[PDB]
Design a protein around this ligand. Sequence first.
Ligand code: CO
Ligand code: CO
Ligand code: CO
Ligand code: CO
Lengths: 324, 324
Amino acid sequence: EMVETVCGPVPVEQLGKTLIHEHFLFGYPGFQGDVTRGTFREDESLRVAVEAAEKMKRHGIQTVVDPTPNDCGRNPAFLRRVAEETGLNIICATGYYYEGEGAPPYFQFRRLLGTAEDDIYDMFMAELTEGIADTGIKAGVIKLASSKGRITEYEKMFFRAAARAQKETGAVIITHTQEGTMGPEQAAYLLEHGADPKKIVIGHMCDNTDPDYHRKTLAYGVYIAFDRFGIQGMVGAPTDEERVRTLLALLRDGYEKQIMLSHDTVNVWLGRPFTLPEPFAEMMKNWHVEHLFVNIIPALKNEGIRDEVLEQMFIGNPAALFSA
Amino acid sequence: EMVETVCGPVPVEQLGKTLIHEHFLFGYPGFQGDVTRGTFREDESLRVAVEAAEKMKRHGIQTVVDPTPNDCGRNPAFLRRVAEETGLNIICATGYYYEGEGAPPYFQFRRLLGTAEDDIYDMFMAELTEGIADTGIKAGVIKLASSKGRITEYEKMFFRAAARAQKETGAVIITHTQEGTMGPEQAAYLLEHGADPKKIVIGHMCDNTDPDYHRKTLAYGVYIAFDRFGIQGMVGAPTDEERVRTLLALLRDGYEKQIMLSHDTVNVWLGRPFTLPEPFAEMMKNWHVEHLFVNIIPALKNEGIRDEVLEQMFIGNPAALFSA
Ligand SMILES: [Co+2]
Ligand SMILES: [Co+2]
Ligand SMILES: [Co+2]
Ligand SMILES: [Co+2]
């Protein structure tokens, strides 16, 4: 009946309205090497992160799951500062990213030593049950990620280790899927290694616009997340209009007890600042923590989606997910 | 007349006996994610690094070039602690590793933004002429690295930026070659982009046992390094016996003014500790900073190599390399 947050154990019944997937900080692996020109400005970063948290609170959000991977600049102590300042519950993750935006050399080397999968399991257990570094903060979810059209040999080590850790702890698993691929495959592979579908959220499912793909994933009894609302503009990637269309089809089928919504925001980028080209920037303008509440939810309600269904997704589902 | 060390400017004439390629600290990208079980313990690490420095001093070494890449745990302030304690000159690098043991996502993303190559040049210039982070330490070399059988599109950004920075600063370039490939190609590519061959060291040349490959590289007028003595058994390394065989062939051809020797030690590993299996462990037993002096140099002298040739490699060559 408890979940580990960056401020310690909190009753699951008190989580309330939740965003299942947002980042306060995030950096692409390699950002650390660009420290001279891409300094981490902690004060300004905290101010921005706190402002984001306050924007969430204004729409009734009480809890955020921040699944920033261990190799992507995860900073539990920083998250704790945000939570202490705002009263928001923040749940962090233990896990590594997928190969293309991860840092595989370290555990690839340990794989050559023959200990990598066991080391990963040990890491998960340490961070779920003991604490991260010297912070005293425990992770509340395991973050998994796969590549485009493939769960690689490297990635599979983490999947297997995650299943082992989940069996021992009852921990929630949150995943990344790449470019609308591998949803059913992730669910199937985790379940074959004994993971509990009621403790799994298959992420970035909104990237795929074919509802049959979602239904294949939902068939495993897992949660799915439409967690990238506001991200638009890349070549073959979907629009919010497409995301909403897909979501409406699944709600019509009665899948609301398996669906959660988020934005996958990056409120503070680690490394050097950057700007997107003007056409791309305009397309990305809705990518912020208020977008679900100001734009998407009103659109769902315009289509006749009832408040009880919306409450199921934002309140009921996180409560059920984190409950034994 | 001067080179930047971790303790500031030192006259090139005062560098004396030098090891061209050793790591006080090193981690494979991703080590940061295993912080809980693999925390950097600074007091013990400093004790070990200081001991390594004292071992090198006992054999007359006055200077070490530590080319730890920016994405592999480079810590200039730590190197400065070692140097302040021991009086050893330590010269550090600016650069990123090759793809397979690097963290490319960050600069791959900036390549997509259209700024990466200019950003890398900016970083090199900042770190060579201003300082690394808030340390006040300037790098004295640029570290470059290529993959097996090719210099990738990613890697080439760094090669071009390095040639540009060299033209501007006169900085020395130190390279990594992967599995005995791309020696000639690196030299050719750098010179094509205006780099000075008398300021370039093509590294890991000892991995290749065909002296024609070395002669092809040497014809560009660059330095080469047999810089991995002690590494045998693993990663396809030749044996030290094979390294010595190749080296003797080149010294007898009269190439001593273009050759330098080192071990490429990792004195303190970043991340979780590890042990090699007993067969591998035994093969790697000589991989330490005293090996060239206790074992290899005596083997060379047993093969008729004179003190004047040895002094050319360890004293004359580094002095020439770092001189205008
Ligand atoms: Co993701
Ligand atoms: Co994310
Ligand atoms: Co190397
Ligand atoms: Co090295």
